[PDB]
Design a protein around this ligand. Structure first.
Ligand code: HEM
Ligand SMILES: [Ca+2]
Ligand SMILES: [K+]
Length: 267
């Protein structure tokens, strides 16, 4: 109900077209917006979330952000065509477009994020979660961000799409049988499969006994091990509509952390 100064309808279509040419970009755009928000610390009120601060060294070089230069570079062409949008809004909008385009919820978008002007606003390394660790670590990070256990589990559900790359994280493979689809299947797979050690990946990960084509990280399976998290894994595995709703709300919350003076965009 407040029109942004950029042509948002044309921009959403251009993002969909870009993804249509390179489907794997869809999940990386989600990972980009999440990691741009994940630098927050809600107690220190620092880390410049949702400000495209990851455009600056040192934050672009943190291990947890490896490979995110690919979606950032793809979005440059659109920034040149739509100069009135900030990078920060562009990264968020592209993630929302990607989510919907892969069959996920249509998340109400607010615009007006202001880009970080220099790298002095960047928070320290160590803010991003580490897939080799488990629930004590995951809960520490998500509590730092300001999320509860319900919201933590819903958000990790984004692993429904995309895959790990050895050159970026040292892990390998998709989590689900359709890495291009956004739904509750991460939770379905986590709950329904027998997760066995993958013998051939040097960084410890699990694979499904049934096909061996799926993967889970230590940080994924901790959602089954921790009784508080497991309740939500079960909730989402049996109720895709609840998953879509809860993911929308939490991801919207995530991409609005540390922001001010935002405006509702037209749907
Ligand atoms: C415990 C918390 C999390 C951990 C430890 C974690 C870890 C990882 C790792 C290791 C990768 C592989 C990166 C690569 O090799 O390309 C990855 C990818 C990905 N992550 Fe997460 N993640 C977490 C939470 C989240 C959240 C909250 C979201 C979004 C809401 C998210 C969205 C994605 C997506 C979409 C990919 C696929 C990227 C691609 O296909 O290029 N993750 N994550
Ligand atoms: Ca940031
Ligand atoms: K999927």
């Amino acid at each position: 109900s407040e029109e942004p100064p950029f042509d948002i309808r044309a921009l959403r279509a251009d993002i969909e077209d870009m993804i249509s040419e390179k489907l794997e970009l869809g999940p990386s755009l989600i990972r980009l917006a999440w990691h741009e928000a994940a630098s927050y610390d809600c107690f220190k009120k620092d880390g410049s979330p949702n400000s495209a601060s990851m455009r600056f060294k040192p934050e672009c070089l943190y291990a947890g952000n490896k490979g995110l230069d690919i979606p950032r570079k793809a979005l440059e062409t659109l920034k040149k065509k739509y100069p009135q949008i900030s990078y920060a809004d562009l990264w968020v909008l592209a993630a929302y477009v990607a989510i919907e385009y892969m069959g996920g919820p249509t998340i109400p978008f607010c615009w007006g994020r202001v880009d970080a002007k220099d790298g002095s606003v960047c928070g320290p390394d160590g803010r991003l979660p580490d897939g080799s660790k488990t629930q004590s670590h995951v809960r520490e990070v998500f509590r730092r961000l300001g999320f509860n256990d319900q919201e933590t589990v819903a958000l990790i559900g984004a692993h429904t799409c995309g895959e790990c790359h050895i050159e970026f994280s040292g892990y390998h493979g998709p989590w689900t049988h359709d890495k291009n689809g956004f739904d509750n299947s991460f939770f379905t797979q986590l709950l329904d499969e027998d997760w066995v050690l993958n013998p051939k990946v040097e960084q410890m990960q699990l694979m499904d006994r049934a096909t061996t084509k799926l993967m889970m990280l230590p940080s994924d399976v901790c959602l089954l091990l921790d009784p508080s998290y497991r309740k939500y894994v079960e909730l989402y595995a049996k109720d895709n509509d609840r998953f879509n709703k809860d993911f929308a709300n939490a991801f919207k919350k995530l991409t609005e952390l540390g922001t001010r003076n935002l405006h509702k965009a037209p749907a």
